[PDB]
Design a protein around this ligand. Structure first.
Ligand code: 2LO
Length: 116
């Protein structure tokens, strides 16, 4: 089995996360964990059982919590799927999520080819 080192993953994958952060306005709702109290949405954690956001993914890369690139991809997709599940299709957050998914798809593919 291919063994990936933490810094190899950070060097390869952090730029793809940065590409998401660079999207403005689209990344703005994703830069910190959803706070249902601040946002007045007490149903949030009833619907979203496994929250995820850019800051959490960044911390996981920085602290070596991914063994394999697919685990990073899964967390990015968890973030997207949570947002598409919770938010209405007409909402800013939903449409912003869709743009981030486009950007991520584009950025991640050449990187995955390089890591194989
Ligand atoms: C720039 O875009 C916005 C600005 C304000 C709002 C309303 C408030 C809001 N509505 C938000 C909704 C979410 C959210 C996500 C993500 N998934 O479910 C929910 C609910 C997360 C954060 C949200 N936030 C916080 C926003 C983004 N601020 C963070 C600080 O800097 C920019 C302004 C929504 C948006 Cl999309």
């Amino acid at each position: 089995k291919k063994i990936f080192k933490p810094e190899e993953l950070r060097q390869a994958l952090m730029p793809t996360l940065e590409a998401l952060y660079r999207q403005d306005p689209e990344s703005l709702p994703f830069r910190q964990p959803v706070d249902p109290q601040l946002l007045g949405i007490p149903d949030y954690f009833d619907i979203v059982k496994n929250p995820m956001d850019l800051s959490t993914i960044k911390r996981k890369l920085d602290t070596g919590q991914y063994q394999e690139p697919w685990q990073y991809v899964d967390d990015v997709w968890l973030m997207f799927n949570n947002a598409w599940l919770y938010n209405r299709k007409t909402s800013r957050v939903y449409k912003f999520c869709s743009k981030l998914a486009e950007v991520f798809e584009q950025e991640i593919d050449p990187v995955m080819q390089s890591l194989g």
